[PDB]
From Swiss-Prot, chains G, H, I, J, K, L:
This is Insulin B chain. It comes from the Eukaryota. The lineage of its organism: Eukaryota, Metazoa, Chordata, Craniata, Vertebrata. The chain holds residues 25 to 53 of 110 of the full protein. It comes from Homo sapiens (Human).
Amino acid sequence: GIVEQCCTSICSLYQLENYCN
Amino acid sequence: GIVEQCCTSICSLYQLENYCN
Amino acid sequence: GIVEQCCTSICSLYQLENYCN
Amino acid sequence: GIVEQCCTSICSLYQLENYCN
Amino acid sequence: GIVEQCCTSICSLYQLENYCN
Amino acid sequence: GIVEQCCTSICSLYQLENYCN
Amino acid sequence: FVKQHLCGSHLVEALYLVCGERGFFYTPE
Amino acid sequence: FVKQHLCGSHLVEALYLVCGERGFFYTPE
Amino acid sequence: FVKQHLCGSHLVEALYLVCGERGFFYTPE
Amino acid sequence: FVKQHLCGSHLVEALYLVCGERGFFYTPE
Amino acid sequence: FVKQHLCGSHLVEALYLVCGERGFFYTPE
Amino acid sequence: FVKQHLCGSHLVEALYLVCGERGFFYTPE
Ligand SMILES: [Zn+2]
Ligand SMILES: [Zn+2]
């Protein structure tokens, strides 16, 4: 998932928006 | 400037982009 | 909630465990 | 000591309590 | 102490050196 | 430059003073 | 463990230290 | 924005910047 | 993206998250 | 709590969360 | 080097930057 | 002071400690 992606690959701030409450 | 825009007022990551090279 | 318990009041790392999955 | 342990191995928050004043 | 010197008053990295081992 | 130096080698706080406004 | 005021970024950093790979939910106010 | 390479606590700080006091979920798999 | 108060260290950390290898300038007041 | 893997400044932040304004000693060997 | 208000977590982070492997003592109030 | 090994956001935090509200430039090459 995103936690793994951002650490082993790269991720975007637009993906992190999906984890807001 | 950036303090009035983002610290004393509020800003999001879009206004921050204004201070990128 | 968590802000009243730990930010406006004080809490230790034990109360934080309440918000772990 | 603890500084080395926590970085090359793992350490616990119960060990860090020992370094409080 | 260090809070009065650097938090409530202001200090630079030179006064911080006073609290190095 | 300094950003690369401090990450691949070591740098000093006296070098970072050069980047103040 | 000391009781202290933990707010904003510092509060979710604390949640990361205590929960880690368990995950957490930060749902203020 | 630039793409991100965020490990450990650095991703929780980035989620705080994106979501703030909306709240968020930190959900390792 | 939430609008929030970003100050001091946390504001330049945010500039690092959004600008990264582009660089930035932090020129307050 | 989860076990910790803390290097550099991250262990000083964890000691601040455990000890706070009690104070602490950061003592590399 | 600028003189500034350094408090709490940010003050011990500063002590880590200036003292590093020397170690330090954080003994407030 | 100790010499520094600072990568990523850690160098921006160190520039904030050295320069503060003087401001600074973060300028990767
Ligand atoms: Zn780090
Ligand atoms: Zn802070």
